[PDB]
Amino acid sequence: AYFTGTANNPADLLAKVRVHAESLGWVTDRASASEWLCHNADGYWSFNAGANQFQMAGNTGFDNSLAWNAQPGNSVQNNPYSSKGPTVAQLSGGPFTRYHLFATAAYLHLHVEIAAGQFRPVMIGSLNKRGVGYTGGQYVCGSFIYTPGQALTNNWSSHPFDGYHIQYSNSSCMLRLDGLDGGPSPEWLPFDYTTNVPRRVVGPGRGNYSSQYHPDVGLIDASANELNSSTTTVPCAIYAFGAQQRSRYVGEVPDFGICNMAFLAPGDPLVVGSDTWRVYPLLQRGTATDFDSTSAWVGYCFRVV
Amino acid sequence: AYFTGTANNPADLLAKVRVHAESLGWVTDRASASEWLCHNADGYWSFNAGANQFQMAGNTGFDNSLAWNAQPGNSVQNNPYSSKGPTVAQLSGGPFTRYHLFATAAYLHLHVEIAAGQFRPVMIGSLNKRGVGYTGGQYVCGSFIYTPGQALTNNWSSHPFDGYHIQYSNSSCMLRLDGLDGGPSPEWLPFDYTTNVPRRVVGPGRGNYSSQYHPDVGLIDASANELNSSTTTVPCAIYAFGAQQRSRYVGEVPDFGICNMAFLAPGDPLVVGSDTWRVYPLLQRGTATDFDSTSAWVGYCFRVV
Amino acid sequence: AYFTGTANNPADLLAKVRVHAESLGWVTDRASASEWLCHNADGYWSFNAGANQFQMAGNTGFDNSLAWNAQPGNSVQNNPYSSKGPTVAQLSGGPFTRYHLFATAAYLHLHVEIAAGQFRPVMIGSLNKRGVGYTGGQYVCGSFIYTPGQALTNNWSSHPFDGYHIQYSNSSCMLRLDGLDGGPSPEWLPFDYTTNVPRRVVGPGRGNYSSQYHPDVGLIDASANELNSSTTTVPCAIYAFGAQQRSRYVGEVPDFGICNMAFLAPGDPLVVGSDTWRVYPLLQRGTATDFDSTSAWVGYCFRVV
Amino acid sequence: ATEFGTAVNHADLVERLVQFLTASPDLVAAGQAYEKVFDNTIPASGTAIAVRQVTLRAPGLGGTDAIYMGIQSYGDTALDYYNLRLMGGTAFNPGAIPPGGDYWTAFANYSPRVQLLAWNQPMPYWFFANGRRFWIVVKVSTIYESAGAGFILPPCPPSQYPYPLAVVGSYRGDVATRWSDVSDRHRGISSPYERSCYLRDPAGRWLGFTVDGGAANESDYNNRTLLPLGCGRYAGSSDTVVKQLRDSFGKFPLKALQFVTRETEGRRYLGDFDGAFYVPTLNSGAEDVIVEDGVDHVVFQTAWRSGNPWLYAIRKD
């Protein structure tokens, strides 16, 4: 359910998380020291460990003779971008301070403190359908850093579930939505807003950035109560834009929330009801208005069980 | 029906019009060389001939022992003005060039050319109910001139059916409307607009003056057609304002219309259909924009039978 | 007078029109399956049928030993252009939908619907002198298309009687005017406006283009009457520019007019007087402002007898 | 001549309109039915509903007139509208249509288009028609869309002005709009604004009428208006008798709607709306029926607001 560990290199994190998944019944179609093709009852995913980063992609079928980025219905070729790039999570060379892993039969969440105050999330799973009838729903998110030393959360940066970024090559997260607007079932919609593509998706990923496009943003800003110092969980609703520019609410992120960390220290819990919450910062602790050099006070909350 | 004559003095006009009325069955309750109290099936009227003007008043009952302006339900005391004055038609000393008289069982219309180009109307009757259920409807109108030599149609002037005038002493026309807003039946509403009195009435009297208050004004301006030189009759609708400032359309002037005399000479007829029309200027012939020294080109049209 | 037919190839059109001309007394100095040297009492013409286009030239004398483009006084060498090219009418490979031919002793007019909505004119004759004493007057006009798929009536295109075109190699029509400004009698003036040559000619050919140089252009735009839906014929006056830049009106196109086809369908007749008119579009039916992809609503009118 | 009903959708609504125009017992018995001279579906619908185009001919009451009208259905699913466009003309020729484009340019002295706003759903509807003019009203929840066209009644003999054609719609047909539009431009017949009512001049030139001025509109139409609701030209106050009009002892006064033009060249009265009048709001509203001299009149209000100056009655006969 909740595991903690350490890793000097990304390969160690990779080995440990596969060990955990296998111990929990996760089905790995093909495994190696650096490359994974795995699946569950919900979807198929493929991962590869680089020297200092992780490459992730979704999948719809399996072929052992195809490369890690060439599986049937892979997101590389079936996406609106002209660049045709897969999901990237840019890590460091290590050693990593620690890693915190949430494992379930339907989703896998990871938060790695690579260095003092430096954190990277890696998210995989399927959105809670909540009774809505749609095929797909599998989401894969990584973390990207623009340039060290300069504004780290600059406009060109992309983040999990992000609603605003400028980049023509790579995406930080992606969501499956099948048969949208009469197209072929395999459709891997990225989180983009400026490409003006007919079909796309959007989320609260950046939190409370000045130009974040989501109507629940104010809730995150207001997630903290000054009168009683109480904090609440805000569902992470995702939105989809179709051909006629007519949006459709698609769902919420399972067991996940976003909040303001103004009055909380990293890891400080606040039990709301019978369920317990673990809160950690996205990238690093800074001030309220430091949207350039850090991730301000946005905090990711996971339900610990 | 249509009579023409001459008179050196107002008394002669008075004698002739009583002779005509009596010949037509009009009932004169009391007659003299200068004072009249008469009535018909519709209402009661009282007239008095001064040296150079006519004094008119409405009535609801008769008393031979009361003065000309003291009959039961007389308009002098039963009107919203503080001044309490009766209807006045300011004429000249004569000799009068001519007079044109329209006589019927329900109304009496007079147009007197006192001098070359100088005309005075005098109107009495009852509005055509047109099926509307209301008590009263008797209207009496005279003509007032502000000052000779200066702007004759100045703002302070008042005219038959006028919709805009400034004066605290006398009125140029008046209309009966009984039981308005729960008041006593005897109510003699004047044509005033600036007194802000709770109950009042308004008409197209001034024609197409800059500050005339009536929505049909544009019709009079447009009463002439340039393409075919055709002229039409515009009903003279009257409006009433009550306590809650909520207006009520009350009716139209029988056998009467207003038009533009731009392309017509005085007395020039234009037969529209089987009925024949006689058109005459209100006060005098001038130009289009002479609203100060004359009555511009407003023309009164009567159906001749 | 008025003939209609079909042709799968230009050679068929050629054979049929020679048959018609011979049946009408036209004198053909030399005939072949593809090349013609013919003449009448007015002038001499030479035609050649290519694979997908017609080559036309004027002539002043005959020599059977000279090529089609080498006759005495041919326009190729006796024109102000440095390129020295003959008249060209660019057709298609067929099959041609239909062809409509007007034949007379003095002129020959042809309008070929090569495909649905695609029309090509070919005009030969002599201008009506109208009593003006000048030698020559023979005009030969063809049709040129710039490039299929792009703006078909682009600026570089040239049309019969055109007043504005950009091209250094070929011309779409040409007019004889002998002895202009003391030069040798053989002079074949082209319809050009931008070459700044001392001697040239201009016509209403393009109709109502934005940069058409002719003072009667507005008539074509106004050729239609909205009030009564009436259409009139506008004479096609031609203008000549001499050495001192002093223009001279030269004449009008016989039995020919230009009009606006906004409220008419192709072939719709409107009999103005005892003479009957046949109207057809120049190139294709489009909208009012489509001067790039089609010939807008310019319609050529011929007097049918 | 009158039909009250509920159409399952816009296509069925147009079908019912044409069936009414051709098979109403009054129309057929008196021989006043219209002729469909054209009916087509040219475009290849993509993310849009099928487009119907119809052109009909009316002969008038006397059988000696020539009236040409055109109707269109145009819709888009992504923006979710199923607009109905209307236009009028004097002549028609399918051969005059240029390649591609549209057919409404083939009309001689073509007029710009007006429209009514609907969608694909059951909608209550009210049709009125006579050999010279047709009126359409649709109840969209609490809103009422209304349009129509036909001949006005000039005060002059028909011999010299045989063709007094007027067209009126709730909004201009040169742009696509969604019927949930709340802007002040979405309004009714009794008060055109921004190209919502056109009338053909005897000279053959179409003139637009607007009850209120507008910078976006061309300057020429500022001088010509519908006087009844345009009393503001001569009055020196915002509040006038017309906005405070109210019934009289239960009697609702019907006031005729009037065309007028006041140009520098000269003046001219053009005529009245046949079967349309102004009526007040207080104590009343739409769907009301009032009987005058044995003739009934229905009430309707404009989409923007239902205030006093935006409420008109239509004769039902």
Add this chain to the structure above:
Amino acid sequence: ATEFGTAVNHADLVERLVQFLTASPDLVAAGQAYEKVFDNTIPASGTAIAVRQVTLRAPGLGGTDAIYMGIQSYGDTALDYYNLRLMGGTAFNPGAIPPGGDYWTAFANYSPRVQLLAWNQPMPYWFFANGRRFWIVVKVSTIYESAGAGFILPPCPPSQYPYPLAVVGSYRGDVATRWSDVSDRHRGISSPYERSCYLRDPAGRWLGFTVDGGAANESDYNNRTLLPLGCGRYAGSSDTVVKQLRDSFGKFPLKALQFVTRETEGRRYLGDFDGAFYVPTLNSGAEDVIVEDGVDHVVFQTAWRSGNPWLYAIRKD
């Protein structure tokens, strides 16, 4: 707890409201009925309709709360309105009323009034009520007036904030307005504007919420709003996802309405509307009923416009 009907007039409508509040089988059986602590008619009606004043007490679901509400009927025949005013409070004392004046000043920590606009005529009506909050909706032709008041659901224990009273109405109650008002200020619960929704702070000071700014409104409320429809604060474009929201494969998503305040002193989340949500317009409209998890929801739209951002659903239970 729910009643759908048609009241012959405003007085009968108020009578039916009180009869519902005191004799609904659910209310009486569960012992949740309200108590009328005051009922009077103080003024001497002139050219106006009789004025009813009522003050009722609600105990809440648990029977340990104290809720005080006041209702009024105020009408004028000349201007032809029969407005219904509403207010909330914590305490009441008839002896505190000064000579003359009015009784609504006697309320301790009195709040300004809101209202709903009606007139004397048959009107279809929809009442919802629960021991903590009441909602009123009225269908005036194609317009829908709506108002209500009760406790919101804060995320904190009631022990320290026992009194989260909110009041909402279509327009401010400090002025008399005629229901034919077409101004943009006449709007609904989901989008208050110009003093159309008040909420009591735990400090005991009433704060007003508005989804859009206004110069005439006081500066303090510009900072506190209803975020769902107030997405414009953070977005850098007029068109956003919220105005383009639409159903998903026939499933209509219900979005909760949220109070939020963003002051310089500090931030605080206050709670949600109990039984009110936002919903889209396309392919739908008012009077529609949608079933989610066996619980039904009715649809309604605001008087000004029925566009996407002005359309809210109310839980009917």
Add this chain to the structure above:
Amino acid sequence: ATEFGTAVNHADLVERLVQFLTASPDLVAAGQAYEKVFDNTIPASGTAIAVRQVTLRAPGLGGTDAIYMGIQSYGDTALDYYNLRLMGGTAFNPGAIPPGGDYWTAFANYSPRVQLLAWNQPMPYWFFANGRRFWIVVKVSTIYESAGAGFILPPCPPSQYPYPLAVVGSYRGDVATRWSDVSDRHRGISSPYERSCYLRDPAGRWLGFTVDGGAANESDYNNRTLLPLGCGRYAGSSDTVVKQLRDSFGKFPLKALQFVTRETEGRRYLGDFDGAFYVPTLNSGAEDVIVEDGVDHVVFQTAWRSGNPWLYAIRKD
């Protein structure tokens, strides 16, 4: 139908004009003479010359038309002008004249006035007249004043447009001007500018034509013009063929002058000037006579300049 002479003064010139119109052998023999319906001298001349007012009726060639024209003489000695004003109309009524003022307002659908500029002295003069139109030219030293009025020749049957009346003068008649005026506005028939040529529309509204634009002029007339000299609309250069036109081997080409209107509502061709054409300047000038097909044409030039685009020929028959 034609007279060339020298009038001793303006009054004698007008006398000779009327004597020509009533006693020309062609006019009387063919029964085409005009009728003087009015002749008067209303004003009391102060430091001014006597004012003559005349109104005449023309029946047309066929004897079934009704043409009404008015002429006036107006002069001032101090400023030293003896202007002659002209106007046209359809009806006349001496009783319609208001007290004082003037009689030209009595005309039904009255048109504004034009004029010609002269003085009291021997002046050479050229009159042309036909049952439908009259033309006046006067040689003032090296300047040529010219004016006239009558029916144009539309391309449509007279049955529907019986009244194509046009009036043209050298300068606008709304102001008093001295014939020594050198401004560019003082010009001729072939090129009206600033209200120098009016034409009556079939709708009954007078429209002004100008060959060049002007800010002081109203916007509406900018769209309607005389195309022949108005080639600048479509050409993209100042110098065009029309200004460089010249004779052809001694043959002078006569080009008809054309009315055209290009409005947003629609287009319409109106007709041609009957007996007026454009001609070049080089090697020629005024007083020249050119014979075409046995019909003679006289030449004239405008007061401002005698350049190529300001030189017109009139048919003398």
